[PDB]
Amino acid sequence: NDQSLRSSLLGLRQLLRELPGDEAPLDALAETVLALLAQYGSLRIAGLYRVRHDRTPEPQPLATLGEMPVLDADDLLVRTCLERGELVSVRSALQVCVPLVDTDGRILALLAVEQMPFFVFNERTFSLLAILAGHIADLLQSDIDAQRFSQYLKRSLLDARDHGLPACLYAFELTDARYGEEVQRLLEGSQRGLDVQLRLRNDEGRRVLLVLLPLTSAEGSQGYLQRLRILFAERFGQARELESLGVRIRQYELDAGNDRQALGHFLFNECGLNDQQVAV
Amino acid sequence: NDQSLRSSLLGLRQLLRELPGDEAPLDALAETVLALLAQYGSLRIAGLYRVRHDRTPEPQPLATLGEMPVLDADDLLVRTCLERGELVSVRALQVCVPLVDTDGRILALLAVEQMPFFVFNERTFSLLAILAGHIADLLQDIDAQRFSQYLKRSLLDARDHGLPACLYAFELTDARYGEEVQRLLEGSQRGLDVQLRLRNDEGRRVLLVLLPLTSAEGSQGYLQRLRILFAERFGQARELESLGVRIRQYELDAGNDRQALGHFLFNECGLNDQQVAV
Amino acid sequence: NDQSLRSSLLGLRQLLRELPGDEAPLDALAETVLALLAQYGSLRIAGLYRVRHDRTPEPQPLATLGEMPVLDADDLLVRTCLERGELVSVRALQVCVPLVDTDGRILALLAVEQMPFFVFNERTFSLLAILAGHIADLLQDIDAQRFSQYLKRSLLDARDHGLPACLYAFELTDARYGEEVQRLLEGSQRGLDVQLRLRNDEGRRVLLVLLPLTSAEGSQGYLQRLRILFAERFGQARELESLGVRIRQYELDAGNDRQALGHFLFNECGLNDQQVAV
Amino acid sequence: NDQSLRSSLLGLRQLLRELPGDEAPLDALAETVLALLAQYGSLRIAGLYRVRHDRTPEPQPLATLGEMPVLDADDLLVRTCLERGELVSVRSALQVCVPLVDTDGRILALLAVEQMPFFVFNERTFSLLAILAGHIADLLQSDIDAQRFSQYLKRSLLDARDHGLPACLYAFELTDARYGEEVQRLLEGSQRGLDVQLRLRNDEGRRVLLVLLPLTSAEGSQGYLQRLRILFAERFGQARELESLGVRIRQYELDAGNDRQALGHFLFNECGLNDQQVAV
Ligand SMILES: [Mg+2]
Ligand SMILES: [Mg+2]
Ligand SMILES: [Mg+2]
Ligand SMILES: [Mg+2]
Ligand SMILES: [Mg+2]
Ligand SMILES: [Mg+2]
Ligand SMILES: [Mg+2]
Ligand SMILES: [Mg+2]
Ligand SMILES: [Mg+2]
Ligand SMILES: [Mg+2]
Ligand SMILES: [Mg+2]
Ligand SMILES: [Mg+2]
Ligand SMILES: [Mg+2]
Ligand SMILES: [Mg+2]
Ligand SMILES: [Mg+2]
Ligand SMILES: [Mg+2]
Ligand SMILES: [Mg+2]
Ligand SMILES: [Mg+2]
Ligand SMILES: [Mg+2]
Ligand SMILES: [Mg+2]
Ligand SMILES: [Mg+2]
Ligand SMILES: [Mg+2]
Ligand SMILES: [Mg+2]
Ligand SMILES: [Mg+2]
Ligand SMILES: [Mg+2]
Ligand SMILES: [Mg+2]
Ligand SMILES: [Mg+2]
Ligand SMILES: [Mg+2]
Ligand SMILES: [Mg+2]
Ligand SMILES: [Mg+2]
Ligand SMILES: [Mg+2]
Ligand SMILES: [Mg+2]
Ligand SMILES: [Mg+2]
Ligand SMILES: [Mg+2]
Ligand SMILES: [Mg+2]
Ligand SMILES: [Mg+2]
Ligand SMILES: [Mg+2]
Ligand SMILES: [Mg+2]
Ligand SMILES: [Mg+2]
Ligand SMILES: [Mg+2]
């Protein structure tokens, strides 16, 4: 399936890591950020603007696309976007404004779109742009904590709503104290891409590894479980399966149909975790 | 300073490194590869097709976008494309973009049935072809051969598309530091950078470092990283020249005369054509 | 676990790296070289002499310890020493120790007029010769040749003196990680360790790493450093085998049969005798 | 001249840097430390012992040489050595005891010598052993501060007394504000081996670089100044000398004849520094 989004973010994540510490990342990566948003939105004319502490934009663009006019801070789209911290569209001398907002609610920057074609001017594309902008904002703010894990969860919740993209959450319960340490080792070993992991003990005292796969469909997670069973068979041979080593696999999909209510049930009732271990 | 292409390729390289080795890369990444091309061309209807060893396309698509009609392998645009190993446009389909590596093997075919008028131009065709060519390379003396293939790619990017690359040649003249300094230099490598260790005709260590999709100016980040790594090992006070490091730079751009690069590598750096192909 | 010899050589290597290139190394370090030998033999009266291209010693000493008498080049101990290229003792002088590199070129001569009875034995002669041989090397395909010279040294240390060395062969089987992992492995190199990048007969990256004056057991520090560097890049969770790294170990000791090392390099590692000499 | 001592310490310094952080350095390098002391003292029978917080030795040796007898904590040499923190000799069932003592006065370890030959049983060799033991103790305690610099100075003072080895102290005064920044850059560049450097401003407001060459004779420093003039001619050509760029070279030798009294005069009166900049 189409993993261009994860791929784009992994690539950008690598770029950020290669940055010389001299210069704010928003400034260094401005043109790249705008280009990525333009690629995802099929944008024709747009600008990328720093947003100040007072939630107003700096009108001198960090980067522009096409013949972008001077930014008008009185524009209704600009004002509604920055006041509410949400994507806004005419669906104003602009067509859509997308804020780059981190999970703490802080607006780092603003994408103002002057022109984008009718065939991408819709809630599906708007959602993609919003997801990409929020994930970029998260990356810009970055330099196994339960605290951090909870933030990644929050982002995936934001991703999942509306025309938004789902995420998958695995809970590997190590019910057999004999093969517990071993199996946990295999599991952490298998992190790849954007996987995020957290080690906990459930209410039975058993080791539980939570694995969040952001921006991952059911099809994408089925594949994840298969890479896993592959590795399992690499250390332990084909004879034995994960389930034979006392591993209980629980799965929850973050999608449009559910939200924080169902996420808590899964974690606190099905997984035997508590509100103090993971913050929903 | 727009690094989106480099960033897209870096993401792809990571997806590749971390897939199970049971599925051929083209097949596992098809939908992803088509999505990326579609973004670069604002494509609306298109298909991605495997090309066989004999420059014929398999009929059944690896991925499609929009209501893509059945591919007609006898299509004028298709045949001319696969015959030339090059992007062809109508200046039934609108554009064909082959995915061809630096050796000329066609891995796949992008068949475009519909894209908007406002992107139906050479600047856009250029981008599609560059992206296609770098994807093909990702999907495809061993070390010297690899380096020369990548060098060839950057020569294409530059002459065919006006996209820059930067080549550094580091000569290490002090045998007392050469080994260690060489390894430090190598540690400066960014994601898509490629490098080659050599001995020149004076017996000296030479490191060639190619920065694709990078201008002489935009390679200042690379150099800064390099000066940081050195300063960590030897202190911020010690100069690279005191360690016997000579630095030479060569920017790849459509501008150079066609003998310059050969002059730089063979005549200035004292290398030969069993070490690097130009 | 006594690393004093390695530490003495490391200090010498640094003195060398940081002298101005106007003075020949033997001459600038003479007093230092004699002091070190004198320590290893509890020498009381001795001289250090340059040996000419024709295996004759220059009469005037580079350095002396105690009331060293004029050197008689016709001295039985001197001639036999320089003729053999080996340490000779009286079992006018007591011991002659040549400084000879792995190619058999005699750089210098240690002439001992007096040392105590309690150190006049093979165990001591052994140490003097090992020290002398490693100093000579410091004072003296280019990379493959260098590596094979060092390999030869460690074979001498082991067979002539019962001093251990350890050889690791790392084969990188996953092309997706090979380049990066190779560089990480190379970063594990300690002061006097020597290493060589190769491609085996299956086309795979191979890193050979020699740890002189190091036992299989005492090479655990090296491995630990290696596992720390990997854990920094890939996390403490990721296994080297998951990155396609195969590790083989070969301990150099007087014990192996004389065909083992050749079997290990050529037959097990798939290398050839243009890549490594055994 | 004979730089075996500096060489030994540079080598040991490199060994310590190669150590995996897992294990106290005294424990990891014990055999090497004992071997180095044995090499410098021509020792025949000896042991290396940890010294505890209470200034008593742990009788189980970290390392031994020859047929070393059990350590007797009642031995007069052992007791006098540890009580005074100084080398002691019969010049007791032992012949000499050398404490490994850092500049803060802390005894890390003890070298007990059962047998060493008459031809090294003398104050010259005793001094060498003491210097080596103190320098090793300093290295064991290590993980441009004026505070650190002052410690290095103190060690060289300790080194210089009695049958001890001298050190040289350079003070490069940059009298010409035109070529000041440039020349200072060259000077810091030239640190090699055990050089220790400190940047200060003197009482005229001029940049002054202090350079301490530990365990360095006058002959050894003459060579240092020549490496320097060589580098100077590398950046600035042969035409101009250091002195033409406003560099005033002051020199003081730490030797047996002087001590802290003369060191202060040089620093505070000839160099125009003060007691607050460097602590003598
Ligand atoms: Mg993109
Ligand atoms: Mg107004
Ligand atoms: Mg409008
Ligand atoms: Mg619980
Ligand atoms: Mg659901
Ligand atoms: Mg770029
Ligand atoms: Mg990508
Ligand atoms: Mg396959
Ligand atoms: Mg096909
Ligand atoms: Mg499809
Ligand atoms: Mg190397
Ligand atoms: Mg590099
Ligand atoms: Mg790197
Ligand atoms: Mg570019
Ligand atoms: Mg770049
Ligand atoms: Mg950069
Ligand atoms: Mg760099
Ligand atoms: Mg720079
Ligand atoms: Mg060119
Ligand atoms: Mg070639
Ligand atoms: Mg050793
Ligand atoms: Mg030494
Ligand atoms: Mg010379
Ligand atoms: Mg001579
Ligand atoms: Mg002499
Ligand atoms: Mg490399
Ligand atoms: Mg290594
Ligand atoms: Mg290293
Ligand atoms: Mg050894
Ligand atoms: Mg060792
Ligand atoms: Mg070690
Ligand atoms: Mg290591
Ligand atoms: Mg280990
Ligand atoms: Mg052997
Ligand atoms: Mg060879
Ligand atoms: Mg020694
Ligand atoms: Mg008592
Ligand atoms: Mg006694
Ligand atoms: Mg002052
Ligand atoms: Mg004096």
Can you describe this structure in just a few lines?
4 copies of one chain form a homotetramer. With 280 residues, chain A is an alpha+beta fold. Helix content of chain A is 41%, strand content 20%.
- Largest interface summary: A-B, 36 and 35 residues
- N-to-C SSE series of chain A? HHEEHEEEHHEHEEHEH
* Tally of DSSP helical segments of chain A: 8
Q: What is the count of β-strands of chain A?
A: 9
CATH topology annotation of the largest domain in chain A: Beta-Lactamase
Q: What shape does the CA trace of chain A take?
A: elongated
Query: What is the fourth-level CATH superfamily of the largest domain in chain A?
Result: GAF domain
Major sheet details of chain A: 5 strands, antiparallel
**Helix/sheet category of chain A:** alpha+beta
- Architecture (CATH level 2) name of the largest domain in chain A: 2-Layer Sandwich
Give me the Rg of chain A, rounded.
21 Å
**How much of the sequence of chain A is in beta strands?**
15-25%
